[PDB]
């Protein structure tokens, strides 16, 4: 407090330092836990466009400087922002008829919902008796991995309107999904996300693998979103000549890499 | 197995022995080749 | 936006007298009166009103004290201060800093205790 | 301040311990409430914190970013630290800071138990990391400066593994083991 | 929804300006120390505020010298009475 | 500032700051000894001008002394001039005479200057690295006692005086003095332009002679003898490692060329002089012989030559590269020597299951745990949380009468093993 007063005296009133509000840790932990679920607290307010908690100015913690405490809380708020924004991005629930991302993407989002459920379970498993620094260090790796995966999936926590990051690419589907997953797995093969990325790839391929099974066994194209490389043109599929084989079911050959 | 249990460790043993593309190839093409 | 209550120069001077004497403002009343008398007096313009000229004079003075490393450090700090642009009156602050410099090499002519007689 | 000092060592600079992009974490100024010898001890601790901050900056620089799927992964290795070995290096750095984080947490617990503890107890307890961190930081800075690429970085680590500090040797052995695990995975794929 | 995001950026800009001021103040303190001015953090801040108010450096120096002589007599008495 | 000033008055006075903290002290003759001496001096010499003396607290003096002994620089009372700790002249304590305080502080300052010279050590070479490591361990051991003294001071329950602290540190102070002299002779007496090999050889000979001196010094040097033995083990560790590498792999890996034997790269294995010229002793000065190894230096040379020949003879893949005891699984010459010395001197899925239990306690029953995801989340959160993954007692004090001579202990714990490996 003395040092902040001295700094204010030196700054001649121009730096309106937000008044340091001293809060008890047995409370700060609760605010941190709310951030871990992306919930805004008395110290952290949710910035709606970012779906991000914003720290109340002038948060003071006992035993630490309000500026240093604010820095720590800013890092924790960034992790909570990543959690809440990622949850919202993954929260696209139902593969309804308006869902154009396909069944592989829908299954991926289901797996992502499972992942976020596991994250919530972990956050709830965190005892509120842990230290703020201990909790921060324990979740530092997990938050970094979550941020890396969110950027990798284009579902990065940054608000699309405020982040001058270019347009977050639509989550790849079908062959595009497979290529995206393969590239990320190669790039993230050393990360803690590599097993998780493999799990998500399996889960997203499961509807695609069912479609593949039906195509291979019955020649039935079960691709509801056009993700399979083969399209069936039923007008020629009813043909009883060479044209039946060539045009009734057509494999999209030109973009074989994309199909 | 892949990622479907918890305590299970063999579920990823191939995933640690084999690379994800090679693991997926081995896992998918063998039944695929049989059916084809 | 309520610019921290930088108490008026009279209050600041009283606080400064109290701080310098290590006594409360009420205990520094004679010193406060002396300070008020000095502050109300017409002061000659500072020797140098050029930020760079004042900085150069400070560097030269440090060199004169055989503090050549300190002279270089002073020139560097002056460059840094000029680049920072925080001070509005660079010439006045530079002149003040030059005026407040003390030569460590010159054995302090110990102020005879007799000077205290006039402080009261 | 001790909690503030740890926060600065945990990457939260304050008014006393300022972080400078050029200077790293540093004590902002001499404070009237410390003996100048205490100021010197604080400056040494701020040196350690600066090294930790620089390590954290490097960790973020090479691990903190999601790997951009730039089509040519080979060219990622040139400018930015990239490569499976680069990811392994960052992971090793984080693992080596994990024991440091644990020691910092133990210090935090001790300070919570006894509010009368002084900096000398920390300086005793943290001296092992005050010796460890400078050498690993020098090794990492050398790797960055020489642009060691791919497994050739591993060769430098081996050269660095020949260090005289037993704890530095062990830490570099752990990092080398992780990188060798990745190398062995690639070698297995090839073979 | 956008507006809530803006306040954080404004606060960050103000904090960056304040941090820059703090760095500048530390540099200024170091410069004063190199010049052997004898000002402490509180005394230096008071002098800066006074200097910011336009005080003549010659007048300020004379006032400082007189205050220092009075302070030295008072400090000698305080050290003698304990 | 008012609350801060009240604390500053109650949290211990700024006397450690150049601001004069005037503190109330008893005017009793026994308590005002400084003041009584000032009165007598003032009364005795009409030419006597009273110098300005700074009154310092005894507890404050003790704390600053401990900080100096803890290796803190920039003390207020004790200034370091040309690497010499010097007391500020205007310091006085209530209970000591200026001359008496000056004498005690001069002794303390001499010890602090010694520490400071020792504190400045950079470790540029393997042997210098070992010496630095040993010095760091010693300084740790000293800092432990210093921290315990500081803790006792902090408790403030009992009167601790400077004399009491000096007496407590007397054995440590003596060890520090012996170490300072030994270090000065081994390193400080070494000319700066000496080759790193030459510096190392001089240090090694100094170590051997010091070892002999301390062994002759008897029980009173037990702590010092232990220190020297640990230092010798550490300094030989790089040397013993190089010897082990030469014996096992037949290759002298000496980046700094600090070993007394240098391999001549100009002598190929198929050269007639391979057996003779390939590995050359740095024999330019006869002084390059390692005194502690000198009794075994010839056997060492023969073993190294044999291993260098075998590795340098294009041997068919000889089965005697057994996949069994790896040289890494072989106790290193430093490790084997330490183990043999200690023995002669009698000297010194589960994580997945945990993650599954955590999930069962915190995950809803119906959500299938994904084992790849389970492992990932375990590593990032649970394995992150459960990372509470936080010595050769060469002390002759136990059986100094039964401890063999340094050369005898070497011959019995290391040399027999070295001879065995050479014979094999």
Swiss-Prot record, chain C:
Tissue: Ubiquitously expressed.
Post-translational modification Phosphoserine, affected residues: 113
N-acetylalanine carried by residues: 2
Localization (cell): Cytoplasm, Cytoskeleton, Microtubule organizing center, Centrosome
Domain of life: Eukaryota
Family the entry assigns: Belongs to the TUBGCP family.
Quaternary structure and interacting proteins, as annotated: Component of the gamma-tubulin ring complex (gTuRC) consisting of TUBGCP2, TUBGCP3, TUBGCP4, TUBGCP5 and TUBGCP6 and gamma-tubulin TUBG1 or TUBG2. TUBGCP2, TUBGCP3, TUBGCP4, TUBGCP5 and TUBGCP6 assemble in a 5:5:2:1:1 stoichiometry; each is associated with a gamma-tubulin, thereby arranging 14 gamma-tubulins in a helical manner. Gamma-tubulin at the first position is blocked by TUBGCP3 at the last position, allowing 13 protafilaments to grow into a microtubule.
Function: Component of the gamma-tubulin ring complex (gTuRC) which mediates microtubule nucleation. The gTuRC regulates the minus-end nucleation of alpha-beta tubulin heterodimers that grow into microtubule protafilaments, a critical step in centrosome duplication and spindle formation.
Name of this protein: Gamma-tubulin complex component 3
Lineage: Eukaryota, Metazoa, Chordata, Craniata, Vertebrata
Encoding gene (name): TUBGCP3
UniProtKB/Swiss-Prot annotation, chain D:
Alphabetically ordered keywords of this record: Cytoplasm, Cytoskeleton, Intellectual disability, Microtubule, Primary microcephaly
Purpose: Component of the gamma-tubulin ring complex (gTuRC) which mediates microtubule nucleation. The gTuRC regulates the minus-end nucleation of alpha-beta tubulin heterodimers that grow into microtubule protafilaments, a critical step in centrosome duplication and spindle formation.
Name of the gene this protein is made from: TUBGCP4
Oligomeric and partner information: Component of the gamma-tubulin ring complex (gTuRC) consisting of TUBGCP2, TUBGCP3, TUBGCP4, TUBGCP5 and TUBGCP6 and gamma-tubulin TUBG1 or TUBG2. TUBGCP2, TUBGCP3, TUBGCP4, TUBGCP5 and TUBGCP6 assemble in a 5:5:2:1:1 stoichiometry; each is associated with a gamma-tubulin, thereby arranging 14 gamma-tubulins in a helical manner. Gamma-tubulin at the first position is blocked by TUBGCP3 at the last position, allowing 13 protafilaments to grow into a microtubule.
Assigned GO CC terms: centrosome; cytosol; gamma-tubulin complex; gamma-tubulin ring complex; membrane; microtubule; microtubule cytoskeleton; recycling endosome
GO biological process: cytoplasmic microtubule organization; meiotic cell cycle; microtubule nucleation; mitotic cell cycle; protein-containing complex assembly; spindle assembly
Protein name (database record): Gamma-tubulin complex component 4
Tissue specificity as recorded in UniProt: Ubiquitously expressed.
Signal peptide: none
One MF annotation (Gene Ontology) recorded for this entry: gamma-tubulin binding
Keyword Transcription regulation in annotation: no
UniProt entry tagged with the keyword rRNA-binding: no
Organism (species): Homo sapiens (Human)
Covered residues, full protein: 1 to 191 of 667
From Swiss-Prot, chain E:
Signal sequence bounds: none
Modification sites for N-acetylalanine: 2
Cellular-component GO terms for this entry: centrosome; cytosol; gamma-tubulin ring complex; interphase microtubule organizing center; spindle
Pfam families attached to this UniProt entry: MOZART1
Intrachain S-S bonds: none
Main location: cytoplasm
The keyword DNA repair belongs to this UniProt entry's keyword annotation: no
Oligomer status and interactors: Associates with the gamma-tubulin ring complex (gTuRC) consisting of TUBGCP2, TUBGCP3, TUBGCP4, TUBGCP5 and TUBGCP6 and gamma-tubulin TUBG1 or TUBG2; within the complex, interacts with TUBGCP3 and TUBGCP6 to form a luminal bridge with actin that stabilizes the initial structure during complex assembly. Interacts with TUBG1.
Entry similarity comment: Belongs to the MOZART1 family.
Protein name from the UniProt record: Mitotic-spindle organizing protein 1
Organism of provenance: Homo sapiens
The encoding gene: MZT1
UniProtKB/Swiss-Prot annotation, chain F:
Expression tissues: Widely expressed, with highest levels in heart and skeletal muscle and moderate levels in brain.
Location in the cell: Cytoplasm, Cytoskeleton, Microtubule organizing center, Centrosome
Transmembrane segments: none
Highest taxon listed in the record's lineage: Eukaryota
Disulphides: none
Cited function: Component of the gamma-tubulin ring complex (gTuRC) which mediates microtubule nucleation. The gTuRC regulates the minus-end nucleation of alpha-beta tubulin heterodimers that grow into microtubule protafilaments, a critical step in centrosome duplication and spindle formation.
Record's subunit section: Component of the gamma-tubulin ring complex (gTuRC) consisting of TUBGCP2, TUBGCP3, TUBGCP4, TUBGCP5 and TUBGCP6 and gamma-tubulin TUBG1 or TUBG2. TUBGCP2, TUBGCP3, TUBGCP4, TUBGCP5 and TUBGCP6 assemble in a 5:5:2:1:1 stoichiometry; each is associated with a gamma-tubulin, thereby arranging 14 gamma-tubulins in a helical manner. Gamma-tubulin at the first position is blocked by TUBGCP3 at the last position, allowing 13 protafilaments to grow into a microtubule.
Family statement: Belongs to the TUBGCP family.
Protein name: Gamma-tubulin complex component 5
Native organism: Homo sapiens (Human)
Species lineage: Eukaryota, Metazoa, Chordata, Craniata, Vertebrata
Parent-record interval covered: 210 to 701 of 1024
């Amino acid at each position: 407090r003395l040092h902040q007063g001295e700094l204010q005296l030196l700054a001649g009133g121009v730096l309106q330092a937000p008044q340091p509000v001293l809060v008890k840790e047995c409370e700060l932990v609760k605010d941190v836990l709310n951030v871990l679920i992306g919930v805004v607290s008395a110290t952290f307010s949710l910035c709606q466009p970012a779906q991000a908690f914003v720290v109340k100015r002038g948060v003071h913690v006992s035993g630490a400087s309000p500026e240093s405490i604010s820095s720590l809380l800013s890092e924790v708020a960034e992790y909570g922002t990543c959690y809440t924004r990622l949850s919202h991005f993954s929260l696209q629930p139902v593969l309804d008829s308006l869902y154009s991302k396909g069944l592989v993407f829908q299954a991926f989002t289901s797996g992502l919902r499972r992942y976020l459920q596991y994250y919530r379970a972990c956050v709830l498993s965190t005892p509120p008796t842990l230290s703020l620094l201990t909790i921060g260090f324990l979740f530092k790796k997990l938050g970094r991995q979550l941020r890396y995966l969110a950027e990798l999936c284009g579902v990065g926590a940054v608000l699309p309107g405020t982040c001058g990051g270019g347009p977050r690419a639509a989550f790849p589907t079908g062959v595009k999904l497979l290529s995206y997953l393969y590239q990320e797995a190669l790039h993230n093969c050393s990360n803690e996300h590599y097993p998780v990325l493999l799990s998500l790839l399996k889960t997203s391929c499961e509807p695609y693998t069912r479609f593949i099974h039906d195509w291979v066994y019955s020649g039935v194209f079960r691709d509801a979103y056009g993700e399979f490389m083969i399209q069936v043109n039923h007008e020629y599929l009813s043909f009883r000549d060479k044209l039946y084989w060539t045009h009734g079911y057509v494999l999209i050959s030109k973009e074989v890499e994309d199909c | 197995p892949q990622v479907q249990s918890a305590a299970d460790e063999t579920a990823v043993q191939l995933s640690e022995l084999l690379t994800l593309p090679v693991l997926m190839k081995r896992s998918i093409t063998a039944p695929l080749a049989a059916h084809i | 936006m309520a610019t921290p209550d930088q108490k008026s120069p009279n209050v600041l001077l009283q606080n400064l007298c109290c701080r310098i004497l290590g006594r409360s403002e009420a205990d520094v009343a004679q010193q406060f009166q002396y300070a008020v008398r000095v502050i109300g007096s017409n002061f000659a313009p500072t020797v140098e009103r050029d930020e760079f000229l004042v900085a150069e004079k400070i560097k030269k003075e440090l060199i004169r004290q055989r503090r050549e490393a300190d002279a270089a450090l002073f020139s560097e700090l002056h460059r840094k201060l000029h680049s920072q642009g925080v001070l509005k009156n660079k010439w006045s602050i530079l002149y003040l800093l030059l005026s407040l410099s003390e030569d460590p090499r010159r054995q302090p002519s110990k102020v005879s205790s007799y000077a205290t007689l006039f402080a009261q | 301040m001790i909690h503030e000092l740890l926060l600065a060592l945990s990457g939260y600079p304050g008014s006393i311990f300022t972080w400078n992009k050029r200077s790293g974490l540093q004590v902002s100024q001499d404070f009237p409430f410390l003996h100048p010898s205490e100021t010197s001890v604080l400056n040494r601790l701020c040196r350690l914190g600066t090294d930790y901050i620089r390590f954290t900056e490097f960790i973020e620089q090479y691990t903190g970013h999601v790997q951009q799927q730039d089509h040519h992964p080979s060219q990622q290795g040139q400018g930015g630290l990239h490569g499976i070995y680069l990811r392994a290096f960052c992971t090793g750095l984080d693992s080596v800071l994990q024991p440091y984080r644990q020691a910092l947490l133990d210090l935090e617990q001790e300070f919570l138990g006894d509010p009368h503890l002084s900096i000398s107890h920390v300086n005793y307890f943290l001296d092992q990391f005050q010796l460890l961190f400078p050498s690993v930081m020098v090794v990492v800075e050398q790797i960055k400066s020489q642009k060691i690429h791919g497994c050739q970085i591993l060769e430098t680590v081996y050269k660095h593994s020949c260090g005289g500090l037993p704890p530095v040797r062990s830490a570099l052995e752990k990092i080398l083991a992780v990188c060798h695990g990745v190398m062995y995975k690639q070698l297995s794929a090839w073979m | 929804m956008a507006s809530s995001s803006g306040a954080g950026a404004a606060a960050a800009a103000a904090a960056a300006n304040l941090n820059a001021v703090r760095e500048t103040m530390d540099v200024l303190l170091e410069i004063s120390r190199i010049l052997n001015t004898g000002l402490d953090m509180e005394t230096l801040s008071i002098c800066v505020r006074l200097c910011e108010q336009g005080i003549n450096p010659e007048a300020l120096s004379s006032v400082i010298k007189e205050l220092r002589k009075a302070t030295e007599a008072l400090k000698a008495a305080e050290n003698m009475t304990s | 500032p008012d609350d801060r000033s009240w604390l500053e008055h109650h949290v211990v006075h700024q006397y450690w700051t150049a601001r004069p903290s005037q503190f109330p002290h008893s005017l009793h003759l026994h308590s005002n000894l400084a003041a009584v001496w000032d009165q007598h001096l003032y009364s005795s010499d009409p030419l006597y001008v009273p110098d300005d003396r700074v009154l310092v607290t005894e507890t404050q003096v003790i704390r600053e002394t401990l900080w100096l002994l803890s290796g803190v620089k920039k003390l207020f009372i004790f200034q370091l001039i040309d690497g010499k700790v010097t007391v500020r002249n205007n310091i006085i304590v209530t209970h000591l005479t200026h001359s008496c305080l000056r004498s005690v502080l001069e002794q303390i300052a001499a010890y602090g200057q010694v520490v400071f010279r020792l504190q400045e050590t950079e470790a540029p070479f393997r042997t210098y690295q070992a010496f630095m490591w040993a010095l760091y361990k010693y300084f740790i051991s000293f800092k432990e006692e210093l921290a315990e003294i500081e803790k006792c001071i902090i408790n403030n329950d009992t009167t601790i005086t400077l004399a009491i602290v000096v007496d407590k540190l007397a054995p440590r102070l003596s060890q520090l003095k012996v170490l300072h002299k030994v270090f000065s002779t081994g390193v400080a007496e070494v000319p700066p332009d000496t080759r790193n090999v030459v510096r190392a050889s001089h240090l090694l000979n100094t170590l051997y002679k010091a070892i002999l001196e301390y062994d002759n010094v008897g029980e009173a040097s037990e702590q010092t003898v232990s220190l020297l033995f640990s230092l010798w083990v550490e300094t030989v560790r790089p040397y013993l490692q190089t010897v082990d590498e030469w014996i096992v792999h037949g290759h002298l890996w000496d980046g700094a060329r600090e070993f007394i034997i240098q391999r001549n790269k100009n002598v190929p294995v198929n050269h007639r002089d391979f057996w003779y010229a390939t590995y050359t002793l740095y024999s330019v000065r006869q002084h390059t012989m390692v005194s502690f190894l000198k009794p075994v230096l010839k056997q060492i040379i023969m073993a190294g030559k044999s291993m260098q020949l075998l590795k340098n003879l294009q041997c068919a893949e000889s089965t005697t590269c057994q996949a069994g005891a790896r040289d890494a699984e072989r106790k290193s010459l430093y490790t084997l020597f330490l183990e043999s010395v200690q023995s002669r001197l009698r000297t010194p899925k589960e994580n997945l299951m945990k993650m599954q239990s955590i999930a069962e306690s915190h995950l809803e029953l119906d959500d299938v745990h994904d084992p790849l995801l389970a492992i990932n989340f375990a590593r990032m959160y649970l394995e992150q949380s459960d990372f509470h993954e936080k010595d050769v007692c060469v002390d002759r004090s136990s059986e100094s009468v039964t401890c063999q001579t340094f050369e005898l202990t070497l011959r019995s714990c290391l040399y027999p093993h070295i001879d065995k490996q050479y014979l094999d």
